[PDB]
Amino acid sequence: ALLSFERKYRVPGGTLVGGNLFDFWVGPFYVGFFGVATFFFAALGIILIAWSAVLQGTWNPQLISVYPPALEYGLGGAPLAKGGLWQIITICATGAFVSWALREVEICRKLGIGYHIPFAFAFAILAYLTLVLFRPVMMGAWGYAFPYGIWTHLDWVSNTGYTYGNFHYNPAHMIAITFFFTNALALALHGALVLSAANPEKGKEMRTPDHEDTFFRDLVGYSIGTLGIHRLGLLLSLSAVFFSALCMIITGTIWFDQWVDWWQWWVKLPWWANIPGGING
């Protein structure tokens, strides 16, 4: 079934691979070559998850956990039950994520729109590969990657962070958090501003974008603009994820101590490094 306005857009073309061979829809979903690829990787990865559950001895989704190989395996392959399933599932997950992105691109082309969406999605993919591929490889073992389990992968975050004291002191970690908080702040304000204009007080006509601008100049003396706020939100969310991957690719690779020790270059500058008094004096 279609939306009332959808048919005129359902023309052939825009594919990157296969021509018209996979140029069709299943219900609302557009297929395309990378739609078939996504299904192939996704189905194959899910089977291996169910298989790992059988080896594990449980069907409770809260307990299933696919662990990577032990550190002793280094970067080599492992048997299925001893980290091999994690290795294969990681390949399938990557295949699905990348296929998904290239499918979005095919859809951008058929709709004659820009490619901002798959471009932004690639940052999330990059953060995933930072944690399962780039950082493990640079550290020399797949075991440094995180396990595929609802709860075990939270334990991984907690164990990995406390290996370096309080991870809060990771300076890139601070920046990434700042973009995460600022983004949610910007998202709330933007949604509220449009709704406040499209849904004014009772007994009022719909407001205009000028009202949106005036509201924010009145409030904080500046309005970024209707185009600028969408540029900004895209920026805040991608920068947040960019400094996330950055704050981890350096942990365990070029920095090994407690992240609080990183702030000593400021404290121990040989001129005020000894002035008595204060906290560090």
Binding site: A1, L2, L3, S4, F5, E6, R7, K8, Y9, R10, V11, P12, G13, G14, N20, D23, F24, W25, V26, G27, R109, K110, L111, G112, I113, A198, K204, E205, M206, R207, T208, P209, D210, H211, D213, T214, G225, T226, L227
Partner: protein, 240 residues
């Protein structure tokens, strides 16, 4: 059954209702779903259609009620390529001229958008007292080049969003003296030229024209922008 357990169970209930509400609110346009022949589809999904709401539009422009009887209000030059559902519909003629596919446009009101005071939101800079180029390259006077590396015309003016203080169109004078508008988001201002990758130099004349030299309607904007974006798919044969 401690207070924490009840809090989290309550929240999951509240969240399910919230999602149901959000989804129905997002069915105020494009629903009910249609078959590929325009009739109503048997399976509409589990979420019902929301009840009508009314916006009172400013400047005496009337009221909009959504949901309401939908209508393209224009002919669609396409045809089925399969008896079964889910397959592309092929253009029956020239898709750029017939405004289908990536060249689609919507039958919006044949009026210009207005600012908060009731004046035209978009104006040519020659009619916008005080406006000027403040940074970047001024494209006025520059030649406009198509994807065939041929020159189609030259920039003669900039159409400005006055409330936002933002360039939205280039007015390009064609070899025959007439002008066309070009979306600012589809052009590439360089040092010595303006380059448009979406159209070939001989497709500029096909851009829809406006009926007034000092204002553009929402319908005209949709026809212009749709045509230019459609060139990405439909003008590629002569794209170097």
């Amino acid at each position: 059954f401690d207070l924490a357990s009840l809090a989290i169970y309550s929240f999951w209930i509240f969240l399910a209702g919230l999602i149901y509400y959000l989804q129905t609110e997002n069915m105020r346009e494009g629903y009910p779903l249609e078959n590929e022949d325009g009739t109503p589809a048997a399976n509409q999904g589990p979420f019902p259609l929301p009840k009508p709401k009314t916006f009172i539009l400013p400047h005496g422009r009337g009221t909009l009620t959504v949901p309401g009887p939908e209508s393209e209000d224009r002919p669609i030059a396409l045809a089925r390529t399969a008896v079964s559902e889910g397959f592309p519909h092929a253009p029956t003629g020239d898709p750029m001229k017939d405004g289908v596919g990536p060249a689609s446009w919507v039958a919006r009101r044949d009026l210009p958008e207005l600012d908060g005071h009731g004046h035209n939101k978009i104006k040519p800079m020659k009619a916008a007292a005080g406006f000027h180029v403040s940074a970047g390259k001024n494209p006025i006077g520059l030649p406009v080049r198509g994807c065939d590396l041929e020159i189609a015309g030259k920039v003669v003016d900039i159409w400005v969003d006055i409330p936002e203080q933002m360039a939205r169109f280039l007015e390009v004078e064609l070899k025959d003296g007439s002008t066309r508008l070009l979306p600012m988001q589809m052009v590439k201002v360089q040092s010595n030229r303006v380059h448009v990758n979406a159209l070939s130099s001989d497709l500029f004349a096909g851009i829809p024209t406006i009926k007034s030299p000092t204002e553009v309607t929402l319908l005209e904007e949709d026809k212009i922008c749709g045509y230019v974006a459609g060139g990405l798919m439909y003008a590629a044969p002569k794209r170097k």
